[PDB]
Amino acid sequence: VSKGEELFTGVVPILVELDGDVNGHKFSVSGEGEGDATYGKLTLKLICTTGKLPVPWPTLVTTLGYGLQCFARYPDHMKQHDFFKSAMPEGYVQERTIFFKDDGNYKTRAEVKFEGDTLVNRIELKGIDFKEDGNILGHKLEYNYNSHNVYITADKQKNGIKANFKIRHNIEDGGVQLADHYQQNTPIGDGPVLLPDNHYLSYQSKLSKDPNEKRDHMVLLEFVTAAGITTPGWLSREQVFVLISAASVNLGSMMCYSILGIGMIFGCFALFELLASLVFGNYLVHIGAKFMFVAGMFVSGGVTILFGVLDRVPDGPVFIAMCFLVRVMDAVSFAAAMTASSSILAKAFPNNVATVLGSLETFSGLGLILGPPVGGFLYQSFGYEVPFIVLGCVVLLMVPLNMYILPNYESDPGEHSFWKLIALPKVGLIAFVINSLSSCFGFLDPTLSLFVLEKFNLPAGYVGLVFLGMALSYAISSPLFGLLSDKRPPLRKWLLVFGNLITAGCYMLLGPVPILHIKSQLWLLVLILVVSGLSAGMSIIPTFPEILSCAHENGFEEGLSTLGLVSGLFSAMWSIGAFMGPTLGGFLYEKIGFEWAAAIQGLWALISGLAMGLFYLLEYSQVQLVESGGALVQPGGSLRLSCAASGFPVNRYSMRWYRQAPGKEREWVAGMSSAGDRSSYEDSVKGRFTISRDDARNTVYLQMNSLKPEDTAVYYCNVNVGFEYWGQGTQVTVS
């Protein structure tokens, strides 16, 4: 890792210029765009100035957009195999030979270098031996480009790298055109360059037309990732430092909450907890996540030190000015700590999101089980003021160690507001889920001790024990359901919608309803409490990656600002639930007992769960393609394969059928256009294969007869609606 990565953290403007001729016809292209190399996202607007440009727009893309190799996202183990960022304080030179099957070739020479802040790619193009009625010069290619893999090897004699890749251009009749790209990259200066090992880059592209351009134009969007080299399988110092910091803050805050665990005060706590969470999660990058984290721990230590001074303060005008201020600073410190820790922990682990928060809640359960014992151990020994000041000493002394260990993540300020994120329906229904669960919990806290002591004559140690058992069940069930949420994202939603329903079931049999006619017994109470903790811990974990993936789907820019907004919403809905729960729960208690109030809370949970079920069975549209028809037949047989696809109209889009023999690569076999009048096949499948469509069933059929034993292969189904979606594949063996 040289200095050249330093320029590429952030958004870079891009100027691209092309001066080319194809068979004597000349064209010139100028373009401007922006690019990000931390995530690897590229956006270019390209305009032709000469006139009607002869060659199609996709076949220029790899000349124009792929030349910005230096905005690739290299993961953490790959950074010692980076060449494009290594030789770019000064630039590089890219030569490329592009062979078209049954046609001519492109020869391109490009120079990529910084001018000031901007990045300039100056490209020269030459084309040889194109048919005037062919695929390229006949404008037969489709405005559609798909995903590919670029293979890079080193070349130590020229101090540069070589690259090979192969590209399929979709043709409107149904065919594909295979372009073989051979690429040579050479640094300009004689500085220290970083020679890499063998690795491949995945390229996902999307072409668009701007709605308000009258000249020739193209909008090119690109996602680039790097892979190929195996991993040790463990964590770098960034992730381990974030884990130690999160464990320390959770253990310290649960010590502070546990060892020391009016109406206007209780209102103002949650009231302004909501407001502080909103303002602090909205303006995350303006203050700083590191500064918010250390300031939150410092202010929480100040609260737990100055908490203990209230016994020395007489009641009067000084008492209200101290207690109001301590309550307000407790609320702001909790909001800041929770928001900053969630943002940093989500940023450090981008893929393993739910698992690490589940492990953090396990550390919270450990805090809960080891708070009151050492609290009583110090209380019986020294008194009531010494444990407070020694815990304040621990929380203050963790801060100077925390300053060096936490990393700095600096990002650009956000542009989308909070009203952009809150104005979605799935966000609102998941918010109602969180609000109902937090209200369940707020009602369940104060009433249970009175109810158990009133019906079964049992002291407060037992209700403390069942609260501890509920939170211990939540601490066990949180990491497992977080792990299952991460490994299978499509089962996230049914891990949520069912779970609240199970919670509703626990609020039916918590107090045995007189409609139900079940005899009261306290083992039923403790069993329903453990099952309720399990269902609540199962529900509370998948809400964070679901809202994060929804915001990433609906155009929120990747960075700390999106995580800050999701964390702020999460804490906001927790605060609204914890405010609305105890108030109406106590009111319905003093009206009509605990027994019907538990049923009312279960009814809110039931309504929220059925709303989730109705929404998730009335919105689902994902483009997946299922394949069927694998069998075995002696040579001479016949067979019919089926590709069933949702999420798009099949009659409006083209369809293709591909074939991978074991040991060989993928080859095109069949293609069907949109109008359904034309089809195209390969030479070895011509006349003995048919492609067909039943658009009422949304199914694409391929019939084969006279099967030679050269067709033993896995068959794939190909559609592209902006990104290509590959099928599942069927194995056909002809022995």
UniProtKB/Swiss-Prot annotation:
For this protein, the record's InterPro entries field holds: MFS, MFS_dom, MFS_trans_sf, MFS_Vesicular_Transporter
Q: What does this protein do?
A: Proton-coupled polyamine antiporter involved in the translocation of polyamines from cytosol into secretory vesicles prior to their release via exocytosis. Uses the electrochemical proton gradient generated by a V-type proton-pumping ATPase to couple the efflux of protons with the uptake of a polyamine molecule. Facilitates vesicular storage of spermine and spermidine in astrocytes with an impact on glutamatergic neuronal transmission and memory formation.
Ranges per topology, Cytoplasmic = 282-290, 339-351, 407-420, 484-494, 543-567
Q: What reaction(s) does this enzyme catalyze? A: spermine(in) + n H(+)(out) = spermine(out) + n H(+)(in); spermidine(in) + n H(+)(out) = spermidine(out) + n H(+)(in); serotonin(in) + n H(+)(out) = serotonin(out) + n H(+)(in)
Which tissues show it? Expressed in various tissues including lung, placenta, adrenal gland, liver, testis, and brain.
Q: Which GO terms describe its biological process?
A: serotonin uptake; spermidine transport; spermine transport
Q: What organism does the record attribute this protein to?
A: Homo sapiens
Q: What is this protein called?
A: MFS-type transporter SLC18B1
Organism domain of life = Eukaryota
Encoded by which gene? SLC18B1
The Swiss-Prot or TrEMBL record describes its family as follows: Belongs to the major facilitator superfamily.
Where is the major localization of this protein? membrane
The way it spans or sits in the membrane comes to: Multi-pass membrane protein
What keywords does the record list, in alphabetical order?
Acetylation, Cytoplasmic vesicle, Membrane, Phosphoprotein, Synapse, Transmembrane, Transmembrane helix, Transport
Please verify whether the record's keywords include Nucleus. no
